[PDB]
Each structure stands twice: as C-alpha cells, then as structure tokens.
Enzyme design. Structure first.
Site, PDB file in Angstrom:
ATOM      1  N   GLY A 123       0.789  -1.209   0.000  1.00  0.00           N
ATOM      2  CA  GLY A 123       0.000   0.000   0.000  1.00  0.00           C
ATOM      3  C   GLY A 123       0.830   1.270   0.000  1.00  0.00           C
ATOM      4  O   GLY A 123       0.319   2.339  -0.307  1.00  0.00           O
ATOM      5  N   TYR A 180      -9.643  -0.236  -2.664  1.00  0.00           N
ATOM      6  CA  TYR A 180     -10.616  -0.015  -1.599  1.00  0.00           C
ATOM      7  C   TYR A 180     -12.039  -0.085  -2.141  1.00  0.00           C
ATOM      8  O   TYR A 180     -12.489   0.835  -2.833  1.00  0.00           O
ATOM      9  CB  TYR A 180     -10.401   1.360  -0.936  1.00  0.00           C
ATOM     10  CG  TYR A 180      -9.075   1.535  -0.227  1.00  0.00           C
ATOM     11  CD1 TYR A 180      -7.918   1.852  -0.938  1.00  0.00           C
ATOM     12  CD2 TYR A 180      -8.988   1.422   1.146  1.00  0.00           C
ATOM     13  CE1 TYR A 180      -6.702   2.011  -0.297  1.00  0.00           C
ATOM     14  CE2 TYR A 180      -7.786   1.586   1.796  1.00  0.00           C
ATOM     15  CZ  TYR A 180      -6.646   1.882   1.071  1.00  0.00           C
ATOM     16  OH  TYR A 180      -5.458   2.036   1.734  1.00  0.00           O
ATOM     17  N   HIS A 225      -6.055  14.181   6.767  1.00  0.00           N
ATOM     18  CA  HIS A 225      -7.295  14.010   6.024  1.00  0.00           C
ATOM     19  C   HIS A 225      -8.109  12.858   6.569  1.00  0.00           C
ATOM     20  O   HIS A 225      -7.586  11.984   7.276  1.00  0.00           O
ATOM     21  CB  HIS A 225      -7.024  13.776   4.533  1.00  0.00           C
ATOM     22  CG  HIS A 225      -6.070  12.663   4.263  1.00  0.00           C
ATOM     23  ND1 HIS A 225      -4.702  12.807   4.403  1.00  0.00           N
ATOM     24  CD2 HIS A 225      -6.270  11.386   3.856  1.00  0.00           C
ATOM     25  CE1 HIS A 225      -4.110  11.668   4.101  1.00  0.00           C
ATOM     26  NE2 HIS A 225      -5.040  10.789   3.769  1.00  0.00           N
ATOM     27  N   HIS A 260      -5.712  11.155   9.639  1.00  0.00           N
ATOM     28  CA  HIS A 260      -4.320  10.717   9.604  1.00  0.00           C
ATOM     29  C   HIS A 260      -3.490  11.415   8.518  1.00  0.00           C
ATOM     30  O   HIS A 260      -4.040  11.953   7.542  1.00  0.00           O
ATOM     31  CB  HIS A 260      -4.249   9.224   9.371  1.00  0.00           C
ATOM     32  CG  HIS A 260      -4.637   8.840   7.990  1.00  0.00           C
ATOM     33  ND1 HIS A 260      -5.951   8.844   7.565  1.00  0.00           N
ATOM     34  CD2 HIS A 260      -3.892   8.452   6.928  1.00  0.00           C
ATOM     35  CE1 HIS A 260      -5.993   8.482   6.297  1.00  0.00           C
ATOM     36  NE2 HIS A 260      -4.762   8.223   5.888  1.00  0.00           N
ATOM     37  N   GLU A 295       0.003  10.360   5.977  1.00  0.00           N
ATOM     38  CA  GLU A 295       0.499   9.104   5.428  1.00  0.00           C
ATOM     39  C   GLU A 295       1.626   8.539   6.288  1.00  0.00           C
ATOM     40  O   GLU A 295       2.204   9.264   7.116  1.00  0.00           O
ATOM     41  CB  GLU A 295       0.971   9.303   4.001  1.00  0.00           C
ATOM     42  CG  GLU A 295      -0.124   9.833   3.084  1.00  0.00           C
ATOM     43  CD  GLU A 295      -1.364   8.967   3.129  1.00  0.00           C
ATOM     44  OE1 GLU A 295      -1.254   7.733   2.936  1.00  0.00           O
ATOM     45  OE2 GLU A 295      -2.443   9.526   3.389  1.00  0.00           O
ATOM     46  N   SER A 352      -5.049   3.271  -4.419  1.00  0.00           N
ATOM     47  CA  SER A 352      -4.093   4.247  -3.880  1.00  0.00           C
ATOM     48  C   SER A 352      -2.712   3.658  -3.580  1.00  0.00           C
ATOM     49  O   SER A 352      -2.546   2.442  -3.424  1.00  0.00           O
ATOM     50  CB  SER A 352      -4.617   4.881  -2.592  1.00  0.00           C
ATOM     51  OG  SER A 352      -4.594   3.925  -1.554  1.00  0.00           O
TER      52      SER A 352
HETATM   53  O1  LIG Z   1      -9.792   5.097   0.494  1.00  0.00           O
HETATM   54  C1  LIG Z   1      -9.758   5.314   1.790  1.00  0.00           C
HETATM   55  O2  LIG Z   1     -10.547   4.811   2.596  1.00  0.00           O
HETATM   56  C2  LIG Z   1      -8.672   6.209   2.238  1.00  0.00           C
HETATM   57  C3  LIG Z   1      -7.844   6.726   1.360  1.00  0.00           C
HETATM   58  C4  LIG Z   1      -6.713   7.611   1.701  1.00  0.00           C
HETATM   59  O3  LIG Z   1      -6.461   7.905   2.878  1.00  0.00           O
HETATM   60  O4  LIG Z   1      -5.997   8.014   0.664  1.00  0.00           O
HETATM   61 MN   LIG Z   2      -4.427   8.649   3.616  1.00  0.00          MN
END
Ligand SMILES: O=C(O)/C=C/C(=O)O
Ligand SMILES: [Mn+2]
Ligand SMILES: [Zn+2]
Length: 351
Positions: free
Chosen positions: A167, A174, A273, A185, A187, A285
């Site tokens: 990841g 997802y 975010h 959070h 990254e 992602s």
């Molecule tokens: O797809 C999610 O749930 C989170 C994605 C992200 O934090 O980029």
């Molecule tokens: Mn993220």
C-alpha cells in the site's frame, strides 16, 4: 513568494491537458508551484480521453481476503472506530451486501444533507469496507498516472533494499459502501498519496493544512488523553474520527471536497485528512515522494506502540539528496526547520 500562493490554503482542483498529464512528477511539482500543497489535499481531474481500464466487468470474481466491519463508538463529534475482520468474499458478494436495502445510500437532496446523515448515523448499523486489497485495476500499458509505477524517488526504497511495503510502494484497492470511513491521519512517514476512484458513488474528503497540522494534534491529544499517553502518534492507528463541527468549534482550519468517479486526489506531506464513501465504489491508492518529502520523512513522528508499523530508513535519501547534511544528521545535530508553504525544488521549472 510562496506564502503568497493559496494564502487561504483551500483545496484546489486542476484540469491538466493530456500533454501535462504525461509526466507525473512534473505536474505534482506544478500544482505545488500553484500552492496546492498548502491545503494538504488537491483534486486532479484527468483528461476525458484518458482511461486506466477499458471496462470494470471482470472484477465481480475478484477476492477481498480481509473485509472489515467498521464499528464506531462515540458521541458529540468524537468517535473511535474499531475493526472487525469478516471472512473473505468476492466483489460481487460485496456489492450485493452494499446495495442491499440494509446497507445502501439513504435518499437526499443537497450534499450537506448526506453529510449530516453520515455524522448522525455513524455509530449505527456498522458497514463493511473492502479495504487494503493488494492489486491494481490499471491496464498494463497505461503510462500516465499509473499507481503501479509512478517512478518517483520513493522507488529508492525498493531499488536500494528490495523491501516492499504493501500500500505504500505497492497499490491498494478499496471497495466501499455507504457510511464506510477513513479516520484522521497523515500518510506513513508523512509521504504523499494518490487516490483514484475507478467507479461508483463519490468519496468525500476533509483536510487540515499541514501548517495547521500541529493544532489538530493538540486537539486530538486533549480529546483522547489515554491514547496520547500510550502512543506518541496515536492518530496513525487510523481509529479516530472527528466531525467538521468539532473542528470548527475549536478553531481548526479545514476544507471539504467530494471526489467523483474518474477523479484523482493527491494528499501532501503532513496533510491530515479523513472522509467517507457515499455508496458502493472502488478506489485505488499508493504513496509516493518528491525531494521536498525527504525532510518530512526525517522528522515524521512514528507510532511507538506497534511492531507492525511502517518505518522507512531515511539514510539513502539523505546521502543522495542532502549529502552536506548527512554527517550532521547522523550525529543528531541537523536542526533544519520545515516550511510547509515552500514548493518542492523540482518546480524550479515553473517557479
Ligand atoms: O480510500 C480510503 O478509505 C482512504 C484513502 C486515503 O487515505 O488516501
Ligand atoms: Mn491517507
Ligand atoms: Zn501507536
């Protein structure tokens, strides 16, 4: 000079031409030259001609080995989300449960209403999230914004040591349904991320500017003192949900954006975010890097309570890109201070 671009640190949207879309690192550098990074989050709308896969019809038989039931506990805009791992299941099985009357999107008019429903029914009828699924949905020959091989300097990790972190320098898929959430959070190693929504209902995002990141943490420590005492970076556990009204109440600046199918989101170093999915959808992602990230990498405060946590050796980046500081850094005397407003150096082409 850079303080003057996006002084509002608002989430920006970009519509690159196909010529601009061809070089990934270049356009990331460009949007930073336009101050996009100050918001922590940016939308990039790809050219209409462009498409990552011809059709999303093979996938009903794709396996989700670790589906997650999301139980949420809390009140008054503060929640902790617990994970219950459900037995494996197919995409088609997931969609059935998703579009089910029991788990499907409620009816609504304006978005502000769906948002209100989400923050009201968050703790009820816990959904399942097809999260952290290894894989890509890209056709092998797409050479533009291919999450599988973006070719940034984050590649130095695998190139140098053979190590792959799922990841982070490999793709994740997802599969979401209504009321599925991702908690507040940044990254791992405070990297960038890229998120492409292949299909389905939207994904809505909240974001706090990196230059106000510390304020959000102070709030989070105050609201969750026990967790704060036990881990130096408990938000990295991705269990903490905080409503926009709560942020608003305590003067934390933030922005909202809703991501439509076929749209990219970029998160930036130290951009906090969070968000939720509207209904059945699918997202892909991975993380990536620029030269600007390196200092963030060096200074990231990591989770201190789990062995399992991601920890990238910064040594290779410092030698190759900050050679004059290596000895100083290794001796713990590098007191470089980070300026969240400055764009990555590769944008010298534009600024
Ligand atoms: O797809 C999610 O749930 C989170 C994605 C992200 O934090 O980029
Ligand atoms: Mn993220
Ligand atoms: Zn921890």
């Amino acid at each position: 000079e850079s303080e003057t671009l996006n002084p509002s640190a608002r989430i920006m949207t970009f519509y690159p031409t196909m010529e601009e879309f061809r070089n990934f690192s270049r356009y990331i550098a460009y949007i930073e030259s336009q101050g996009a990074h100050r918001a922590g989050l940016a939308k990039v709308v790809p050219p209409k001609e462009w498409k990552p896969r011809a059709s999303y019809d093979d996938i009903d038989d794709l396996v989700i080995p670790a589906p997650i039931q999301q139980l949420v506990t809390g009140q008054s805009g503060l929640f902790t989300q617990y994970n219950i791992q459900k037995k494996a299941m197919t995409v088609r099985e997931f969609r059935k449960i998703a579009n089910s009357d029991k788990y499907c999107t409620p009816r609504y008019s304006e978005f502000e209403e769906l948002e209100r429903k989400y923050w009201k029914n968050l703790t009820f009828n816990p959904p399942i999230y097809g999260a952290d699924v290894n894989g890509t949905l890209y056709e092998k020959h797409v050479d533009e914004w291919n999450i599988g091989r973006l070719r940034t300097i984050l590649d130095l990790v695998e190139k140098e040591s053979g190590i792959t972190i799922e990841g982070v320098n490999t793709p994740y898929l997802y599969f979401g349904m209504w009321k599925t959430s991702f908690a507040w959070h940044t990254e791992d190693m405070d990297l960038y991320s890229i998120n492409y929504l292949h299909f389905g209902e939207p994904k809505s995002w909240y974001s706090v500017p990196p230059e106000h990141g510390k304020r959000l943490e102070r709030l989070a420590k105050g609201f969750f003192p026990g967790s704060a005492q036990s881990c130096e970076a408990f938000l990295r556990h991705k269990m903490t949900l905080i409503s926009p009204l709560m942020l608003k109440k305590y003067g934390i600046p933030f922005d909202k954006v809703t991501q439509e199918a076929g749209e990219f989101m970029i998160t930036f170093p130290y951009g906090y975010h969070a968000g939720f999915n509207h209904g059945f959808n699918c997202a892909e992602s991975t993380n990536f890097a620029t030269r600007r990230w390196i200092e963030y990498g060096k200074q990231a405060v990591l989770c201190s309570c789990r062995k399992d946590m991601v920890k990238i050796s910064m040594d290779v980046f410092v030698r190759k890109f900050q050679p004059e500081r290596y000895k100083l850094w290794k001796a713990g005397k590098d007191n470089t201070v980070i300026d969240h407003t400055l764009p990555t150096p590769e944008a010298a082409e534009f600024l």
